[PDB]
Amino acid sequence: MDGSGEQPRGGGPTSSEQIMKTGALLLQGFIQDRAGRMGGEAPELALDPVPQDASTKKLSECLKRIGDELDSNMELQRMIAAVDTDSPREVFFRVAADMFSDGNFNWGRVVALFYFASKLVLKALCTKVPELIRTIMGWTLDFLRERLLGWIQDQGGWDGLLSYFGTPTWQTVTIFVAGVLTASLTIWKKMG
């Protein structure tokens, strides 16, 4: 009975509350923007926040600027087309686990995760199964709340995410996630 600390989680910045919240807004943001304009009533994401915040708005510009460049890769588009759905639950956890199956903390994993799921989400939007749209965002925050929560606290907060970019050469961040994301697809084939 002698806790050296006291209340590292009672009230103040760097709280699992600001992280979880920005996390569910950021992803929900790059999607609504990629789905189109907007639609009153929104019977789909009804009880849900909406893009609104000069801070979360800029971090969207980073995921947006690359969501367009990467999504125009005809080679990476030939790759995702080489996979398939069938069991998006096993693949989502198997492919994911592979991104963190070594090392511990990087930058491709995160970016490569939001965009990888963006398709599972958008792809479900076309398929006409909105009850799956919500079931997906569910598997996303599940992995974020369970694994990417303690690590987001040590970096202070999502400020480290955006502080990482700000780099002039934008071809090294697009080739990072692509080189890493494609690797998982390269082996996911069968085994070899």
UniProtKB/Swiss-Prot annotation:
Consequence of substituting residue 21 to E: Reduces interaction with BCL2L11, homooligomerization and triggering of apoptosis
Chain ranges for the short sequence motif BH2 as given in the UniProt record: 150-165
Record-level Gene Ontology MF annotations: BH3 domain binding; channel activity; Hsp70 protein binding; identical protein binding; lipid binding; protein heterodimerization activity; protein homodimerization activity
Renumbered ranges of motif BH1: 98-118
Motif, BH3: chain positions: 59-73
GO cellular component, one term: membrane
PTM text: Ubiquitinated in the absence of XRCC6/Ku70. Ubiquitination promotes protein degradation. Ubiquitinated on Lys-128 and Lys-190. 'Lys-63'-linked polyubiquitin chains on Lys-128 are removed by USP12.
SUPFAM superfamilies in alphabetical order: Bcl-2 inhibitors of programmed cell death (SSF56854)
Sequence positions bearing N-acetylmethionine: 1
Any one biological process term the GO annotation gives: B cell negative selection
A matching Pfam family: Bcl-2
Effect in UniProt of substituting residue 11 to E: In a plasmacytoma cell line
Residues spanning the membrane: 172-192
UniProt tissue specificity: Expressed in a wide variety of tissues. Isoform Psi is found in glial tumors. Isoform Alpha is expressed in spleen, breast, ovary, testis, colon and brain, and at low levels in skin and lung. Isoform Sigma is expressed in spleen, breast, ovary, testis, lung, colon, brain and at low levels in skin.
Comment, domains: Intact BH3 motif is required by BIK, BID, BAK, BAD and BAX for their pro-apoptotic activity and for their interaction with anti-apoptotic members of the Bcl-2 family.
Family: Belongs to the Bcl-2 family.
Protein name: Apoptosis regulator BAX
Organism: Homo sapiens
Gene name of this polypeptide: BAX
